[model samples]
Target: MWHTHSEREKRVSNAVEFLLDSRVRRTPTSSKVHFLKSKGLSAEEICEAFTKVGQPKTLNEIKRILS
Candidate 1:
């Protein structure tokens, strides 16, 4: 987990880069979810409203993702 806002921001930036470089083929909705979740947003809140999809990871698991 990041200790500072700057660190968390950097992690999100790096995760965005990781996503951009990813080879995985996901639906456009799934890709959006990936970016939102990587930025430390709740997948349920965003994806549920935006994509109308079920949450894939629990809140705790989402909290644990790091760059």
Candidate 2:
């Protein structure tokens, strides 16, 4: 009796955590956030994932990378 939408947020956090710890390939956190936002994840959800990380890089740098 529930929509799968709620789990999308869960996946967002999961994805963020993985992206943070992952080494196989790398993407900017901000770019990833921007990408996630494009995928419909909220800033809050992305931050929730950051909470699970010990050290997060500067999220604003995506724009630098973007340019």
Candidate 3:
């Protein structure tokens, strides 16, 4: 059980880092905020979504939360 949990955390961390370093690398900060707003997400909801990841999240994660 502990090994499984560790593997899951590693995968999540790798994915998050890949996205932040690659896919979202060129994405502007304000654009992200605006996109969330357009989705009708409240400030607190957006904050919660990001907070859930325990670190900066990928656009994929943001999409998952908003959807």
Candidate 4:
């Protein structure tokens, strides 16, 4: 029951949506999951969203954020 769509990269949209969503970004880490859940998202999709978070290299970069 799984053989459709001309592509499989569709999964990234979920993550990308989370990645760019400013409201959720500010929605506190504790509620982010539930916020996503309210959107009818499952764990795998949430996993996809969580897994996409990362950035800031060097003291200069982190300092940029820390400051």
Highest TM-score: which candidate?
2
**lDDT of model 2, residue 39:** 63
TM-score of each: 0.33, 0.48, 0.41, 0.46
The all-Cα superposition gives candidate 1 an RMSD in Å to the true structure of: 8.6
Candidate 3, residue 31: lDDT: 60
**Model 4 poorest 10 in a row by lDDT:** 55-64
Better of 1 and 4 by TM-score: 4
Q: What is the C-alpha RMSD of each candidate to the true structure, in Å?
A: 8.6, 4.8, 9.2, 9.6
Worst 10 residues of 3 by lDDT: 10-19
lDDT of 4 by residue, 3-48 (tens): 4332223544664577568876676554655555566555555565
In model 4, how large is the Cα lDDT of residue 66? 28
Best by lDDT: 2
lDDT of candidates 1 onward, in order: 0.47, 0.57, 0.52, 0.51
lDDT of 2: 0.57
Answer with 1 or 4, whichever has the higher lDDT.
Answer: 4
The parts of candidate 3 lying over 4 Å away from their true place are 1-22, 56-67
Task: Give me the displacement of residue 32 in model 2, in angstroms.
Answer: 1.2
